[PDB]
Design a binder for this molecule. Structure first.
Ligand SMILES: [Mg+2]
Length: 138
């Protein structure tokens, strides 16, 4: 079962997180993808995030700052990113995969995700350390 790497991408004010919705599920989650072959974790993240939203994380990523979870036999490592422009025109660079890319108010997700029609993946299980990291970034 191949490891998956992706990114929790926050805006400059640390108020919003950028989530993606695939074309085959209504769940919102981090831009992310599988290890291709022998590439390291950060290069995987940079490549997959660029494919899904068209933004290059090379100069934003820190290999020390991530949240790691094992789910259904899969290791997920989600790198923590801040300072990304809210006016960047995100768009997928691969076909038929990503339906929507949208900024979400982070505080609101934490207060609503349990009583909402909106579906999420991964971010539900990472909310506590995400929240701590956000506080720490201030
Ligand atoms: Mg992919």
């Amino acid at each position: 079962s191949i490891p998956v790497r992706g990114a929790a991408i926050f805006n400059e004010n640390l108020s919003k997180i950028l989530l993606v919705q695939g074309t085959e599920s209504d769940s919102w989650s981090f831009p992310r993808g599988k290890i291709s072959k022998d590439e390291n974790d950060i290069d995987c993240c940079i490549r997959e995030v660029k494919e899904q939203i068209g933004f290059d994380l090379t100069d934003y990523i820190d290999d020390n700052q991530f949240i790691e979870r094992n789910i259904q036999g899969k290791n997920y490592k989600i790198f923590l990113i801040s300072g990304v422009s809210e006016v960047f025109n995100f768009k997928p660079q691969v076909r038929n995969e990503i339906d929507k890319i949208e900024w979400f108010d982070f505080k609101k997700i934490s207060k609503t995700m349990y009583k909402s029609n909106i579906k999420y993946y991964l971010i539900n299980s990472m909310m506590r350390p995400l929240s701590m990291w956000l506080r720490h970034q201030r």
